[PDB]
Design a protein around this motif. Structure first.
Motif, PDB file in Angstrom:
ATOM      1  N   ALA A  11       0.826  -1.209   0.000  1.00 36.74           N
ATOM      2  CA  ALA A  11       0.000   0.000   0.000  1.00 36.74           C
ATOM      3  C   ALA A  11       0.861   1.260   0.000  1.00 36.74           C
ATOM      4  O   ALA A  11       0.530   2.262   0.638  1.00 36.74           O
ATOM      5  N   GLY A  12       1.979   1.211  -0.723  1.00 36.05           N
ATOM      6  CA  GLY A  12       2.891   2.331  -0.798  1.00 36.05           C
ATOM      7  C   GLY A  12       3.816   2.492   0.388  1.00 36.05           C
ATOM      8  O   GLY A  12       4.555   3.483   0.442  1.00 36.05           O
ATOM      9  N   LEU A 116       3.955  -1.964 -45.651  1.00 31.53           N
ATOM     10  CA  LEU A 116       2.766  -1.123 -45.538  1.00 31.53           C
ATOM     11  C   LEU A 116       2.886   0.117 -46.419  1.00 31.53           C
ATOM     12  O   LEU A 116       1.923   0.509 -47.092  1.00 31.53           O
ATOM     13  N   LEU A 119       2.438  -0.866 -50.036  1.00 23.84           N
ATOM     14  CA  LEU A 119       1.034  -1.137 -50.322  1.00 23.84           C
ATOM     15  C   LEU A 119       0.224   0.147 -50.443  1.00 23.84           C
ATOM     16  O   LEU A 119      -0.638   0.255 -51.322  1.00 23.84           O
ATOM     17  N   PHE A 120       0.479   1.126 -49.572  1.00 22.75           N
ATOM     18  CA  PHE A 120      -0.269   2.378 -49.640  1.00 22.75           C
ATOM     19  C   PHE A 120       0.115   3.213 -50.858  1.00 22.75           C
ATOM     20  O   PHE A 120      -0.763   3.705 -51.576  1.00 22.75           O
ATOM     21  N   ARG A 143       2.992  -8.799 -50.459  1.00 21.43           N
ATOM     22  CA  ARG A 143       2.542  -9.016 -49.092  1.00 21.43           C
ATOM     23  C   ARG A 143       3.075  -7.897 -48.206  1.00 21.43           C
ATOM     24  O   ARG A 143       3.722  -6.956 -48.675  1.00 21.43           O
ATOM     25  N   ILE A 144       2.793  -8.002 -46.908  1.00 23.44           N
ATOM     26  CA  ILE A 144       3.258  -7.000 -45.956  1.00 23.44           C
ATOM     27  C   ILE A 144       4.684  -7.260 -45.483  1.00 23.44           C
ATOM     28  O   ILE A 144       5.333  -6.338 -44.967  1.00 23.44           O
TER      29      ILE A 144
ATOM     30  N   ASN B 236      -1.484  -2.910  -5.597  1.00 19.49           N
ATOM     31  CA  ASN B 236      -1.374  -1.543  -5.090  1.00 19.49           C
ATOM     32  C   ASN B 236      -1.445  -0.573  -6.262  1.00 19.49           C
ATOM     33  O   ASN B 236      -0.436  -0.222  -6.874  1.00 19.49           O
ATOM     34  N   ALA B 243      -1.612   5.366  -2.810  1.00 14.13           N
ATOM     35  CA  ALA B 243      -1.418   3.942  -3.074  1.00 14.13           C
ATOM     36  C   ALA B 243      -2.508   3.167  -2.347  1.00 14.13           C
ATOM     37  O   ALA B 243      -2.475   3.021  -1.122  1.00 14.13           O
ATOM     38  N   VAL B 244      -3.482   2.667  -3.102  1.00 17.99           N
ATOM     39  CA  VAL B 244      -4.620   1.943  -2.551  1.00 17.99           C
ATOM     40  C   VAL B 244      -4.599   0.520  -3.089  1.00 17.99           C
ATOM     41  O   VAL B 244      -4.363   0.299  -4.281  1.00 17.99           O
ATOM     42  N   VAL B 245      -4.842  -0.446  -2.205  1.00 15.07           N
ATOM     43  CA  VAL B 245      -4.858  -1.857  -2.585  1.00 15.07           C
ATOM     44  C   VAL B 245      -6.226  -2.150  -3.194  1.00 15.07           C
ATOM     45  O   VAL B 245      -7.218  -2.304  -2.480  1.00 15.07           O
ATOM     46  N   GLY B 287      -4.999  -4.250 -52.985  1.00 14.32           N
ATOM     47  CA  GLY B 287      -3.882  -4.060 -52.073  1.00 14.32           C
ATOM     48  C   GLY B 287      -4.205  -3.098 -50.948  1.00 14.32           C
ATOM     49  O   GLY B 287      -3.879  -3.353 -49.786  1.00 14.32           O
ATOM     50  N   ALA B 288      -4.855  -1.979 -51.275  1.00 21.56           N
ATOM     51  CA  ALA B 288      -5.250  -1.026 -50.244  1.00 21.56           C
ATOM     52  C   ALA B 288      -6.268  -1.640 -49.291  1.00 21.56           C
ATOM     53  O   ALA B 288      -6.214  -1.406 -48.078  1.00 21.56           O
ATOM     54  N   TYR B 290      -6.548  -4.847 -48.518  1.00 19.06           N
ATOM     55  CA  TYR B 290      -5.816  -5.773 -47.659  1.00 19.06           C
ATOM     56  C   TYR B 290      -5.019  -5.029 -46.596  1.00 19.06           C
ATOM     57  O   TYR B 290      -4.973  -5.450 -45.433  1.00 19.06           O
ATOM     58  N   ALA B 291      -4.378  -3.922 -46.978  1.00 20.27           N
ATOM     59  CA  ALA B 291      -3.590  -3.153 -46.021  1.00 20.27           C
ATOM     60  C   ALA B 291      -4.471  -2.574 -44.921  1.00 20.27           C
ATOM     61  O   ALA B 291      -4.124  -2.635 -43.735  1.00 20.27           O
ATOM     62  N   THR B 294      -5.591  -5.415 -42.572  1.00 23.37           N
ATOM     63  CA  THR B 294      -4.572  -5.847 -41.620  1.00 23.37           C
ATOM     64  C   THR B 294      -4.276  -4.764 -40.585  1.00 23.37           C
ATOM     65  O   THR B 294      -3.987  -5.085 -39.428  1.00 23.37           O
ATOM     66  N   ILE B 295      -4.381  -3.485 -40.962  1.00 20.60           N
ATOM     67  CA  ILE B 295      -4.199  -2.413 -39.988  1.00 20.60           C
ATOM     68  C   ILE B 295      -5.303  -2.460 -38.940  1.00 20.60           C
ATOM     69  O   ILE B 295      -5.045  -2.355 -37.732  1.00 20.60           O
TER      70      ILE B 295
END
Lengths: 149, 303
Positions: A11-12, A116, A119-120, A143-144, B236, B243-245, B287-288, B290-291, B294-295
Motif C-alpha cells: 500500500a505504498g 505497408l 502497399l499504400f 505481401r506485408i 497496489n 497507493a490503494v490496494v 492491395g489497399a 488488404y492493407a 490488416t491495420i
C-alpha cells in the motif's frame, strides 16, 4: 520460519516482509511442477491439438518450442518472486536487457513498415517487370513482409 | 391521415424495386406506421386528459399500450390474438397504477389464468425466450396468492422490449438483403460475406438488448454484487495520488473474458463488414483493402 526479510511495498509503505519455509516449499513445488509440465508438454500437445486438427510438423514444432519457452519463463519468474520478490529491483535490468536484445526486431519491423508503405503508395503494381539487385522478373504477389517475383 | 395513407400506398406500390432499393425504405415504412398509430394514441391521451394524479397513470399506460398495438397493426390469426390480448392485459395496467400510489385478487388471478391459457397455444405452436416468458406468468400468478405486481411490470416491459427487438430484427434483415442485392449488382457490373455482417449485427443487437434489459431490471443486483465482491487478489494501484490496494473480482474476470471473446469475434468477422461498408460505398484497390484490413486487425487485437 522467518529466515530472512526484504523491504517490499505494501500500500505504498516500505514493509519488511520475511520469507518462510512455506514460501521455500512453494517455490520448490512450483519449480518441480514447471519441470514436469516442460517434460510432458509434447505428448499433451499432440493428443489435444494434433488429434483435433491436422497441422504441419514445422508449425507443431514451433508451437511446442513457444509453449516450452513461455512455460519455463513463467516458472522461473514465479520461483524468483516467491523466494526473492525483487521485481521492483530487477525491472531496470529487465528494461536495459529488453532494449539491448529487442534491437533484434529492427530488421523485421522495418520490413513490415516498408511493406505497408509500398502497399499504400503503390510504386509497383502486379503484372509489371521489376529489376532490383540484378534480379529482373515479373512481380506475382505482394505481401506485408516479403514480395514474390 | 389522408396524406399518410397516400404515402403508405405509394410506398407499398414501390416495394422491392430493383432500381429504387435503399436502406431508407424500411425506416420510411416504420415512420409511416408510427404516424398511422399516432392518431389513436393522441385520441387516448385526449380522453385521459379530458378530466384532469391517479388518472395520469392509466392515461399513460393506455397510451403506451395502444401505441404498441398500433405499431403491431401497421406492421390474420395473429391480428385476432393481438386484439383479444387487450382484454387480458387491461387489468394489469390498472393493478400497476393502483400499486404505484378481496375481489380484486380474484380478478387478477382470473386475468392471469386467461393470459396463460391464451399463451398456451402460442407455446405449443413454437424460441426458448417465448416459452420462458409464458412460464414466468404462471409462476407470477402462483406467487400472487405486492412484489408480484412489480414482477409483472418487469415482465410486460421485457415483452415490449422483445417485440421491439423482433421488429428491428425484420428491419435489419431487410436492410441486409438490400445491401446484398446492391453488392451482387456491383460485382456483376464489375453468402459468407453477408454472414459476417449478419453476425456483427447480431452481436450489436444482443449487446443493445442486454443493456436495455439491465436498464429495466435494476432491482436484482445481488448477483452483480456477489460477482464484484469475490476479492481474489489485490494490487497496489493509484487513486488520487494515493497507493490503494484494489482487489480484482469475479466481475473483473468475467469482464476480461467477455472483452477477449468480443475482440476475437470482431477479428474473425472483420473483412466481411469492411467489404460490406467501405468497398461497396467506394471502390478501392485490392492491395489497399488488404492493407486497411490488416491495420484494423492489428489495432483491434492490440486494444
Amino acid at each position: 520460519i522467518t529466515l530472512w526479510h526484504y523491504n517490499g511495498t505494501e500500500a505504498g509503505a516500505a514493509v519488511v516482509k520475511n520469507v518462510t519455509m512455506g514460501s521455500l516449499l512453494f517455490a520448490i513445488i512450483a519449480s518441480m511442477v514447471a519441470w514436469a509440465l516442460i517434460r510432458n508438454l509434447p505428448g499433451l500437445l499432440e493428443v489435444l491439438v494434433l488429434s483435433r486438427l491436422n497441422m504441419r510438423q514445422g508449425a507443431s514444432y514451433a508451437i511446442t518450442t513457444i509453449l516450452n519457452y513461455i512455460i519455463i519463463a513463467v516458472g522461473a519468474m514465479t520461483v524468483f518472486g516467491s523466494l526473492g520478490v525483487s521485481w521492483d529491483k530487477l525491472q531496470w535490468l529487465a528494461a536495459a536487457l529488453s532494449v539491448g536484445l529487442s534491437f533484434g526486431l529492427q530488421e523485421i519491423f522495418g520490413n513490415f513498415v516498408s511493406g505497408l508503405i509500398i502497399l499504400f503508395e503503390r510504386p509497383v503494381r502486379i503484372g509489371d517487370t521489376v529489376t532490383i539487385g540484378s534480379f529482373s522478373g515479373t512481380v506475382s504477389k505482394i505481401r506485408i513482409r516479403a514480395t514474390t517475383i | 391521415l389522408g396524406w399518410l395513407k397516400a404515402y403508405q400506398q405509394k410506398l407499398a406500390s414501390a416495394v422491392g424495386s430493383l432500381r429504387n432499393d435503399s436502406q431508407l425504405n424500411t425506416p420510411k415504412a416504420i415512420l409511416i406506421d408510427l404516424i398511422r398509430a399516432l392518431p389513436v394514441c393522441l385520441i387516448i391521451l385526449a380522453v385521459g386528459l379530458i378530466l384532469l394524479e391517479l388518472l395520469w397513470s392509466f392515461s399513460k399506460k393506455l397510451a403506451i399500450f395502444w401505441l404498441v398495438f398500433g405499431l403491431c397493426w401497421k406492421v390474420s390469426h395473429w391480428r385476432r390474438q393481438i386484439v383479444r390480448i387487450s382484454l387480458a392485459l387491461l387489468p394489469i395496467h390498472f393493478w400497476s397504477v393502483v400499486a404505484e400510489l378481496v375481489l380484486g385478487q380474484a380478478m387478477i388471478f382470473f386475468n392471469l389464468l386467461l393470459i396463460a391459457f391464451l399463451v398456451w397455444p402460442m407455446c405449443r405452436e413454437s424460441l426458448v425466450t417465448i416459452t420462458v416468458l409464458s412460464i414466468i406468468p404462471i409462476a407470477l400468478m402462483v406467487l400472487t396468492a405486492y412484489t408480484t405486481l412489480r414482477l409483472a411490470g418487469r415482465w410486460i416491459e421485457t415483452v415490449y422490449l422483445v417485440i421491439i427487438w423482433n421488429l428491428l430484427y425484420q428491419t435489419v434483415l431487410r436492410g441486409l438483403s438490400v445491401a446484398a442485392r446492391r453488392i451482387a449488382w456491383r460485382r456483376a457490373l464489375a453468402e459468407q460475406v453477408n454472414q459476417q455482417t449478419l453476425r456483427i449485427t447480431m452481436l450489436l443487437m444482443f449487446a443493445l438488448f442486454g443493456v436495455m434489459f439491465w436498464a429495466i431490471w435494476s432491482d436484482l443486483i445481488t448477483v452483480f454484487s456477489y460477482l464484484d465482491s469475490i476479492t481474489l487478489w489485490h494490487y497496489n494501484g493509484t487513486e488520487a495520488g494515493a497507493a490503494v490496494v484494489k482487489n480484482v473480482t469475479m466481475g473483473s474476470l468475467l469482464f476480461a473474458i467477455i472483452a477477449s471473446m468480443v475482440a476475437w469475434a470482431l477479428i474473425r468477422n472483420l473483412p466481411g463488414l469492411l467489404e460490406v461498408l467501405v468497398l461497396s460505398r467506394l471502390n478501392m484497390r485490392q492491395g489497399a483493402s488488404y492493407a486497411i484490413t490488416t491495420i484494423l486487425n492489428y489495432i483491434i487485437i492490440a486494444v
